[PDB]
Structures are given as structure tokens and as C-alpha cells.
Design a protein around this ligand. Sequence first.
Ligand SMILES: *[C@@H]1O[C@H](CO)[C@@H](O)[C@H](O)[C@H]1NC(C)=O
Lengths: 49, 50
Amino acid sequence: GKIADYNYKLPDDFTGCVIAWNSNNLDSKVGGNYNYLYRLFRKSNLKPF
Amino acid sequence: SVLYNSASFSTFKCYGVSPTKLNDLCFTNVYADSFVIRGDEVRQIAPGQT
Ligand SMILES: *[C@@H]1O[C@H](CO)[C@@H](O)[C@H](O)[C@H]1NC(C)=O
């Protein structure tokens, strides 16, 4: 996927799981929330973890 | 590579060839199609997918 996906890459083998839940009333700021940042460019890929 | 890196397409997935390897291989007379479809159909174009 995008570079945000390529920032966190899991190994081909992975024991465990992920939990995702919606967050609209706490992480959304009426004036605009900009504390969260992501990566958009890099030299190359990343090893797992 | 550099072309689809900048364009930031929302839907991108390649079958039978890796997108990262695409710069290396050599082809003959690549085709290109183009049309406009309804939203559902964008999740509905795939080989052997009814
Ligand atoms: C639209 O076409 C122009 C042609 O100069 C190109 O520079 C631009 O990247 C294109 N926009 C895309 C691919 O989103």
C-alpha cells in the first residue's frame, strides 16, 4: 500500500492479531487535529519491527 | 515506480507481477485500457471474478 503502510510492516509469519476500533468523538478536533504525523517518503523498505 | 509513487492512486493492485519489480522486466507492446464505472464495480474487476 502507501508509505504509511510501509512504515509499519509485519513479518511473513506473525502470531497474534490486530484490533481496530473507530474514534470520532475523541481524536477529531473541531479546530483541526494535526498532532498525528505519518511518513510519505523513504530511501527503501524496512525490516519487520 | 516514480510515476505511481507521486500520483497517489487510491486503488492499486497487480496480479502475476510485483509492482516493485516492474521497473526491471522487459515487455513487448504493452496495452492500456480506460473507462469510467460505478463505485461498486471498482471492487469488481479481477480475473475469474464474476
Ligand atoms: C495529470 O497530467 C499531468 C501532465 O503534465 C501530470 O503532470 C500530472 O501528474 C497528472 N496528474 C495525476 C497523474 O494525478
